[PDB]
């Protein structure tokens, strides 16, 4: 079965990578573009972009290990460990040319190490709506004069005693609706049907755990990145961020300037954290145009 | 019915204050000292210190509105609103003389306004383990490199949609053990027996809700205090903080210096948030010695 509907002309398939069975949805023809989702979601967050992109590229959208229909990692959830699976998966499909990478939220955490360590393999890079794990994350406020802050959830999810799984189990749909809407500007785009689909997926016990294990490895990822970052990114890079409630604003581009020589950034007014859903048309356009400046 | 065992010689009683029935435990003779507990607990946190103080003072330890065996407030949960109830309670027992005040955690939030608005009513003051609500709280980090963020729970508890009650209902005993121990240095003092007592109390639906309403009013309390703090505290004040895991460290004294003309501070090594239980002997000594500088 499928947790989410596959777009016309795409296929849902699996590949074993280092003994881990990864799920992905693939379509199109041309150079490879890998699209990597984040927390609370699956490959399906890219389902509106995929058909448009597939007109010019071969498009693959994996489920992160442990999430969607992918098996948990057998190594661990730190950025460097997860990035190995994503890198090898991409290379199975693009062994002879560099590929493009688009990542959202923790998709960034799970890809940055393989980008920096395999620069020749990455033609163009698009990063949206999450910090690269580094010392900057220790500066975000716990609480704001308006109420709950953007990343207090880092601590909630990283807490031990399986705090998050224990409190959220049985209330998965309730929690996810709250989390999504609290990080959104445009809540209307999240139908009760769409929320049902996402909630059922991440409520799988191994997926609920996997979700938070990414956060439990965050400090480790920060320490890993402290070494990796000595090497600057040289490929064309674009950042995108929402300017509305839930958005990273100018943070995304400003951080990326420290990592990349060649970067352009956009802040999208009226949009929060969930760019592919909240501001699908302009996000899609920017991504497509940016990637289409390379051979396709 | 008593939620916690009354120390020998003390009485458990109630006083109606502005239409709200407040529970307290009272004992001893002499000048009045009021002890005010914080989140996750009740008057019982003071039960080891009370008999010692009662040798020199009349001691009263109320349950905060909505917590323990006290009815919720009829006005609101902001510091200025709650402090009215506590000031009036204390003044019932000490109508013609100033009294001493010791407060822990949100006990600070709920007493600071009555202290500043009624300075002549307060002889001596001891505050421990929480910021006075002001702009400084917006500076605490959501996520830390080492240990754990001290105040990310502010956002969790303040979040709308009754997020915290909804997730914690039915799992109160689990949550409180996690919260208390994660904020502790000497975790061994929190026996399953003691945790059972505390959890049973805050698991009352109105008490679980009351607990979080204090945090939902926190920004309002900050706004209140911005005006109130234009007048500095004139009475002798002492701050205590833990130096261990979960401790506020030097922050407690440093913030207090902005508020008080006459302040001395102590940081207790190897002690976390829960001073009266984690570090009973040196905490009790510091408090009794400080209050005994006055006539008793």
XYZ file of C-alpha atoms in Angstrom:
592
model
C 0.000 0.000 0.000
C 0.913 3.683 -0.129
C 0.664 6.205 2.687
C 0.257 9.014 0.137
C -1.044 9.207 -3.474
C 1.640 8.942 -6.174
C 1.436 11.590 -8.932
C 0.735 10.469 -12.501
C 3.862 9.196 -14.242
C 5.788 8.622 -11.022
C 6.663 5.358 -9.332
C 6.845 4.419 -5.666
C 9.825 2.098 -5.169
C 12.463 0.863 -2.724
C 16.235 0.456 -2.724
C 18.469 -1.199 -0.150
C 21.249 1.154 0.974
C 23.789 -0.205 3.463
C 21.247 -2.777 4.620
C 18.490 -0.188 5.055
C 15.391 -0.312 2.860
C 14.672 3.219 1.639
C 11.372 4.287 0.085
C 11.223 6.942 -2.634
C 8.954 8.295 -5.354
C 10.639 8.829 -8.719
C 9.670 10.298 -12.092
C 10.861 12.319 -15.060
C 13.870 12.257 -17.357
C 17.111 14.235 -17.358
C 19.729 15.103 -14.710
C 18.828 13.955 -11.203
C 17.222 16.187 -8.604
C 16.798 14.737 -5.115
C 14.157 16.395 -2.894
C 14.460 15.786 0.835
C 11.611 16.379 3.284
C 11.690 17.330 6.956
C 9.984 16.751 10.298
C 6.252 15.946 10.385
C 6.211 15.105 6.698
C 7.333 12.649 4.056
C 8.231 12.694 0.361
C 4.658 13.867 -0.186
C 5.433 17.482 0.739
C 7.060 17.658 -2.696
C 4.114 16.238 -4.674
C 3.140 19.594 -6.187
C 6.694 20.432 -7.278
C 7.506 16.975 -8.637
C 5.359 17.002 -11.829
C 6.643 20.452 -12.870
C 10.275 19.555 -12.170
C 9.925 16.180 -13.930
C 9.427 18.001 -17.228
C 13.151 18.833 -17.196
C 14.778 16.509 -14.631
C 14.713 13.015 -13.207
C 13.171 13.643 -9.799
C 13.604 11.480 -6.745
C 11.967 12.112 -3.335
C 13.033 9.701 -0.570
C 11.478 9.166 2.822
C 14.096 9.914 5.487
C 15.207 6.801 7.392
C 12.550 5.736 9.886
C 9.955 8.099 8.420
C 7.347 7.552 5.728
C 7.911 4.059 4.362
C 11.700 3.964 4.957
C 13.332 1.636 7.480
C 15.184 3.244 10.403
C 18.934 3.788 9.977
C 21.097 0.932 11.222
C 23.946 3.294 12.078
C 22.304 6.322 13.724
C 20.391 9.587 13.277
C 23.271 12.094 13.275
C 23.628 14.207 10.138
C 26.781 12.449 8.988
C 25.283 8.984 9.396
C 21.990 9.762 7.666
C 23.720 11.668 4.880
C 25.523 8.476 3.874
C 22.192 6.783 3.034
C 20.946 9.771 1.037
C 24.260 10.175 -0.796
C 24.462 6.514 -1.783
C 20.802 6.469 -2.804
C 21.381 9.424 -5.150
C 24.525 7.902 -6.623
C 22.620 4.728 -7.509
C 20.611 6.873 -9.913
C 23.256 9.432 -10.937
C 26.593 7.561 -10.904
C 28.124 9.557 -13.784
C 27.026 13.174 -13.259
C 26.526 15.508 -10.310
C 22.953 15.819 -9.091
C 20.889 18.668 -7.682
C 19.726 18.725 -4.087
C 16.700 20.448 -2.585
C 16.101 20.050 1.148
C 13.597 21.340 3.702
C 13.826 21.488 7.503
C 15.807 18.543 8.927
C 16.391 17.515 5.301
C 19.179 20.068 5.589
C 20.640 18.404 8.700
C 20.593 15.077 6.921
C 22.275 16.279 3.746
C 24.821 18.969 4.602
C 27.626 16.560 5.541
C 27.405 14.676 2.232
C 27.314 17.912 0.269
C 30.467 19.246 1.929
C 32.252 15.891 1.647
C 31.227 15.155 -1.965
C 31.155 18.566 -3.611
C 31.924 17.218 -7.098
C 28.672 15.228 -6.836
C 26.446 18.252 -6.184
C 25.626 20.462 -9.151
C 23.285 22.927 -7.446
C 21.883 23.227 -3.935
C 18.610 24.574 -2.537
C 18.132 24.795 1.230
C 14.957 25.996 2.947
C 13.678 26.597 6.486
C 16.109 25.251 9.024
C 19.539 26.179 10.355
C 22.475 24.095 9.319
C 23.392 22.534 12.695
C 26.003 24.854 14.170
C 26.585 27.131 17.169
C 23.920 29.517 15.870
C 21.152 27.234 17.103
C 22.226 27.908 20.693
C 21.185 31.553 20.251
C 17.473 31.021 19.545
C 15.249 32.169 22.459
C 13.312 29.745 24.675
C 10.358 32.130 24.939
C 9.240 35.350 23.281
C 7.233 38.414 24.276
C 4.560 37.068 21.883
C 4.410 33.551 23.339
C 5.949 30.259 22.232
C 9.181 30.575 20.227
C 10.285 28.942 16.955
C 12.554 26.204 18.250
C 11.636 25.300 21.843
C 10.649 22.037 20.197
C 14.362 21.210 19.761
C 14.476 20.690 23.515
C 11.089 18.948 23.714
C 12.113 16.451 21.046
C 15.681 15.952 22.347
C 14.584 15.323 25.946
C 15.205 11.838 27.349
C 12.791 9.363 28.969
C 11.143 9.235 25.526
C 9.374 12.388 26.727
C 8.006 13.341 23.295
C 6.842 9.837 22.279
C 5.219 9.286 25.671
C 3.257 12.535 25.708
C 2.379 12.494 22.018
C 1.330 8.843 21.630
C -2.455 8.667 21.267
C -2.518 12.384 20.481
C -0.451 12.296 17.267
C -3.032 13.986 15.043
C -3.675 16.655 17.703
C 0.011 17.422 18.214
C 0.910 17.530 14.517
C -1.965 19.871 13.666
C -0.818 22.177 16.439
C 2.839 22.013 15.424
C 2.156 22.621 11.743
C -0.315 25.457 12.295
C 1.885 27.110 14.956
C 4.756 27.261 12.463
C 2.503 28.369 9.600
C 1.310 31.651 8.144
C -1.214 30.056 5.802
C -3.004 27.373 7.805
C -5.879 26.962 5.337
C -3.663 24.931 3.004
C -3.654 22.117 5.568
C -6.951 20.339 5.035
C -8.204 17.865 7.640
C -7.527 15.205 4.996
C -3.907 16.273 4.496
C -3.319 16.352 8.265
C -4.857 12.876 8.581
C -2.350 11.498 6.067
C 0.682 13.074 7.716
C -0.470 12.130 11.222
C -1.085 8.477 10.326
C 2.387 8.211 8.807
C 4.391 9.653 11.697
C 2.213 7.887 14.290
C 3.741 4.551 13.331
C 5.648 3.767 16.533
C 9.017 3.452 14.813
C 8.341 6.696 12.907
C 7.251 8.639 15.978
C 10.514 7.561 17.605
C 12.560 8.234 14.454
C 11.110 11.756 14.294
C 12.615 12.712 17.636
C 15.852 10.740 17.288
C 16.909 13.255 14.658
C 16.685 15.862 17.425
C 18.371 13.686 20.018
C 21.336 13.591 17.624
C 21.308 17.355 16.994
C 24.172 18.249 19.363
C 26.206 15.453 17.833
C 25.454 16.844 14.377
C 26.571 20.304 15.526
C 29.868 18.820 16.729
C 30.316 16.893 13.470
C 29.650 20.041 11.448
C 32.238 22.028 13.403
C 34.901 19.981 11.593
C 33.163 19.745 8.206
C 32.600 23.505 7.961
C 36.322 24.179 7.571
C 35.597 23.385 3.918
C 33.430 25.968 2.126
C 30.686 25.062 -0.380
C 31.591 26.002 -3.941
C 28.484 25.070 -5.983
C 25.629 27.466 -6.893
C 23.340 27.647 -3.846
C 19.917 29.172 -3.210
C 18.180 29.607 0.139
C 14.453 30.142 0.653
C 12.651 31.181 3.817
C 9.250 32.472 4.849
C 8.839 36.083 5.938
C 5.623 35.332 7.812
C 4.683 33.672 11.099
C 6.804 30.538 11.472
C 9.459 31.672 9.008
C 13.240 31.895 9.463
C 13.335 35.286 7.723
C 16.817 36.576 6.883
C 18.467 33.901 9.057
C 18.543 31.330 6.266
C 20.592 33.390 3.793
C 22.753 35.026 6.447
C 23.868 31.663 7.856
C 24.413 30.257 4.352
C 26.727 33.160 3.483
C 29.106 31.690 6.089
C 29.059 28.318 4.332
C 28.830 29.088 0.598
C 30.777 31.259 -1.845
C 27.981 31.467 -4.396
C 24.568 31.944 -2.820
C 21.364 33.822 -3.538
C 18.446 34.000 -1.148
C 14.767 34.837 -1.106
C 12.431 35.636 1.732
C 8.784 34.997 0.841
C 6.348 37.424 2.505
C 3.058 35.917 3.684
C 4.594 32.467 4.151
C 5.676 30.501 7.175
C 7.663 27.306 7.646
C 5.884 25.003 5.199
C 6.906 26.629 1.899
C 5.972 23.808 -0.500
C 2.406 23.853 0.865
C 1.887 27.441 2.047
C 3.435 29.142 -0.940
C 3.614 26.364 -3.501
C 3.438 28.443 -6.705
C 6.194 30.989 -5.953
C 8.373 28.403 -4.188
C 8.040 26.027 -7.159
C 8.861 28.831 -9.606
C 12.004 29.906 -7.756
C 13.299 26.348 -7.411
C 12.558 25.481 -11.026
C 14.199 28.624 -12.417
C 17.259 28.264 -10.181
C 17.809 24.608 -11.111
C 17.040 25.253 -14.778
C 20.035 27.583 -15.005
C 22.069 24.373 -15.034
C 21.836 21.752 -17.783
C 18.513 19.881 -17.717
C -8.651 15.083 53.600
C -4.997 16.119 53.398
C -2.921 15.696 50.238
C 0.338 15.791 52.267
C 1.150 14.951 55.915
C 1.108 17.932 58.267
C 4.219 18.239 60.456
C 3.564 17.584 64.141
C 2.105 20.623 65.879
C 0.978 22.329 62.680
C -2.594 22.797 61.500
C -4.011 22.474 58.008
C -6.684 25.120 57.440
C -8.396 27.380 54.895
C -8.979 31.106 54.577
C -11.441 32.693 52.148
C -9.700 35.645 50.447
C -11.601 37.741 47.905
C -13.979 34.847 47.263
C -11.187 32.300 46.860
C -10.642 29.517 49.393
C -6.897 29.264 50.066
C -5.376 26.285 51.816
C -2.438 26.743 54.165
C -0.452 24.959 56.862
C 0.407 27.011 59.931
C 2.491 26.544 63.065
C 4.729 28.218 65.608
C 4.754 31.530 67.457
C 6.275 34.962 66.922
C 6.621 37.217 63.870
C 5.012 35.809 60.731
C 6.944 34.171 57.906
C 5.079 33.146 54.759
C 6.664 30.457 52.545
C 5.420 30.247 48.954
C 6.032 27.157 46.805
C 6.396 26.860 43.043
C 5.415 24.791 40.025
C 5.060 21.024 40.346
C 4.707 21.266 44.116
C 2.659 22.596 47.038
C 3.167 23.851 50.586
C 4.789 20.463 51.314
C 8.109 21.439 49.758
C 8.620 23.479 52.945
C 7.711 20.701 55.387
C 11.302 20.102 56.559
C 12.077 23.789 57.067
C 8.771 24.621 58.759
C 9.354 22.976 62.183
C 12.755 24.679 62.459
C 11.374 28.113 61.611
C 8.403 27.536 63.912
C 10.731 27.687 66.917
C 11.171 31.415 66.315
C 8.348 32.470 64.003
C 4.708 31.946 63.202
C 4.989 30.017 59.927
C 2.384 29.866 57.161
C 2.740 27.958 53.904
C -0.205 28.455 51.516
C -1.072 26.506 48.401
C -0.941 28.781 45.355
C -4.381 29.482 43.835
C -5.527 26.430 41.886
C -2.678 24.244 43.180
C -2.628 21.955 46.179
C -5.917 22.322 48.030
C -6.408 25.986 47.049
C -9.225 27.119 44.752
C -8.216 28.732 41.460
C -8.075 32.553 41.394
C -11.224 34.433 40.395
C -9.368 37.384 38.853
C -6.459 35.864 36.928
C -3.054 34.184 37.071
C -0.768 37.157 36.418
C 1.695 38.027 39.172
C -0.110 41.194 40.211
C -3.445 39.380 40.392
C -2.173 36.433 42.423
C -0.056 38.569 44.762
C -3.238 40.287 45.995
C -4.508 36.962 47.376
C -1.191 36.163 49.074
C -0.724 39.670 50.534
C -4.223 39.686 51.996
C -3.750 36.163 53.376
C -0.525 37.116 55.152
C -2.050 40.343 56.455
C -4.938 38.430 58.048
C -2.332 36.798 60.308
C -0.077 39.858 60.654
C -2.365 42.899 60.430
C -0.211 45.313 62.483
C 3.376 44.206 61.800
C 5.553 43.460 58.747
C 6.150 39.808 57.880
C 8.935 37.809 56.233
C 8.603 36.141 52.854
C 10.374 33.156 51.323
C 9.430 32.117 47.804
C 10.608 29.493 45.309
C 10.089 29.297 41.544
C 6.725 30.787 40.447
C 6.259 31.735 44.105
C 8.487 34.665 43.096
C 6.253 35.654 40.193
C 3.241 35.572 42.477
C 4.726 37.659 45.287
C 7.002 40.234 43.721
C 4.166 42.702 42.955
C 2.813 42.690 46.530
C 6.328 43.189 47.893
C 6.996 46.206 45.692
C 3.521 47.709 46.224
C 3.635 47.192 49.994
C 7.274 47.511 51.009
C 6.528 48.471 54.603
C 4.628 45.169 55.041
C 7.719 43.077 54.202
C 10.469 42.843 56.841
C 12.884 40.503 55.069
C 12.742 38.628 51.773
C 14.241 35.384 50.441
C 13.876 34.418 46.769
C 15.161 31.213 45.155
C 15.318 29.558 41.736
C 13.362 31.615 39.228
C 13.667 34.879 37.333
C 11.476 37.740 38.381
C 9.410 38.140 35.226
C 11.117 40.785 33.067
C 12.902 41.223 29.717
C 15.733 38.907 30.846
C 13.520 35.842 30.340
C 13.530 36.482 26.585
C 17.304 35.978 26.606
C 17.364 32.358 27.829
C 18.199 29.812 25.091
C 15.718 27.309 23.650
C 18.421 24.668 23.225
C 21.855 24.200 24.779
C 25.123 22.537 23.732
C 25.580 20.917 27.121
C 22.983 19.940 29.683
C 19.452 21.108 28.918
C 17.704 24.429 28.352
C 16.338 25.603 31.697
C 13.242 27.406 30.442
C 12.064 25.839 27.208
C 9.124 24.610 29.283
C 7.955 28.252 29.405
C 6.888 27.988 25.765
C 5.481 24.478 26.194
C 3.303 25.502 29.118
C 2.303 28.826 27.542
C 1.324 27.321 24.170
C -2.306 27.743 23.141
C -4.871 25.034 22.301
C -4.212 23.770 25.850
C -1.282 21.912 24.303
C 0.376 20.982 27.605
C -2.767 19.810 29.463
C -3.905 17.850 26.445
C -0.611 15.983 26.135
C 0.011 15.588 29.867
C -3.500 14.547 30.986
C -3.371 10.872 31.980
C 0.451 10.976 32.101
C 0.934 13.392 34.982
C 3.016 11.052 37.136
C 5.375 10.263 34.262
C 5.728 13.900 33.281
C 6.358 15.269 36.780
C 9.081 12.727 37.511
C 10.766 13.715 34.254
C 10.394 17.455 34.862
C 11.575 17.326 38.456
C 14.558 15.050 37.883
C 15.681 16.851 34.712
C 15.877 20.065 36.776
C 17.679 18.365 39.660
C 21.288 17.717 40.679
C 20.570 15.381 43.588
C 17.858 13.274 41.949
C 17.976 10.577 44.626
C 15.824 12.623 47.015
C 12.837 12.214 44.706
C 11.678 8.762 45.793
C 8.793 7.171 43.941
C 6.786 7.708 47.145
C 7.379 11.474 47.158
C 6.719 11.814 43.422
C 3.415 9.933 43.898
C 2.307 12.545 46.462
C 3.160 15.498 44.233
C 1.718 13.943 41.080
C -1.612 13.043 42.711
C -2.044 16.688 43.665
C -1.284 18.360 40.357
C -3.203 15.671 38.451
C -6.491 17.202 39.660
C -7.828 18.628 36.391
C -8.198 22.170 37.736
C -4.694 21.962 39.205
C -3.105 20.735 35.984
C -4.766 23.647 34.216
C -3.894 26.152 36.944
C -0.223 25.081 36.712
C -0.031 26.131 33.051
C -2.174 29.260 33.431
C 0.702 30.776 35.440
C 2.882 30.481 32.351
C 0.118 31.710 30.041
C 0.055 34.903 32.106
C 3.869 35.228 32.141
C 4.088 37.876 29.376
C 1.405 39.859 31.203
C 3.449 39.576 34.400
C 6.498 40.904 32.525
C 4.460 43.882 31.324
C 3.187 44.500 34.874
C 6.692 44.341 36.316
C 8.149 46.793 33.788
C 6.099 49.487 35.527
C 6.476 48.132 39.072
C 10.268 47.876 38.881
C 10.635 51.661 38.643
C 10.711 51.436 42.444
C 13.606 49.489 43.991
C 13.160 47.124 46.947
C 14.457 48.589 50.211
C 14.268 45.660 52.667
C 17.061 43.152 53.342
C 16.888 40.463 50.677
C 18.646 37.130 50.147
C 18.741 35.061 46.960
C 19.487 31.347 46.764
C 20.288 29.335 43.635
C 21.590 25.872 42.858
C 25.010 25.644 41.217
C 24.351 22.132 39.969
C 22.282 20.663 37.141
C 19.015 22.593 36.869
C 20.357 25.469 38.969
C 20.035 29.167 38.017
C 23.635 29.771 39.132
C 24.772 33.403 39.265
C 21.699 34.676 37.398
C 19.561 34.768 40.550
C 21.718 37.294 42.432
C 22.668 39.265 39.320
C 19.046 39.952 38.366
C 18.132 40.702 41.984
C 20.809 43.413 42.176
C 18.749 45.342 39.622
C 15.757 45.143 41.965
C 17.089 45.469 45.522
C 19.305 47.955 47.364
C 20.281 45.418 50.047
C 20.890 41.918 48.692
C 23.214 39.018 49.368
C 23.229 35.876 47.252
C 24.357 32.280 47.541
C 24.899 29.561 44.962
C 24.688 26.079 46.488
C 27.118 23.635 44.826
C 25.798 20.217 43.837
C 22.191 21.398 44.082
C 19.703 21.952 41.279
C 16.286 23.590 41.160
C 14.671 21.898 44.176
C 16.763 23.390 47.002
C 14.525 22.504 49.968
C 14.656 18.801 49.093
C 18.007 18.402 47.296
C 20.017 20.425 49.785
C 17.887 20.692 52.909
C 20.604 21.187 55.525
C 22.498 24.092 53.977
C 19.365 25.728 52.510
C 17.467 25.574 55.822
C 20.481 26.977 57.664
C 20.880 29.895 55.243
C 17.193 30.788 55.510
C 16.868 30.486 59.298
C 20.075 32.447 59.888
C 19.018 35.203 57.503
C 15.522 35.593 58.939
C 16.872 35.402 62.481
C 18.795 38.642 61.986
C 15.419 40.237 62.739
C 13.533 40.134 66.044
C 11.973 36.714 66.671
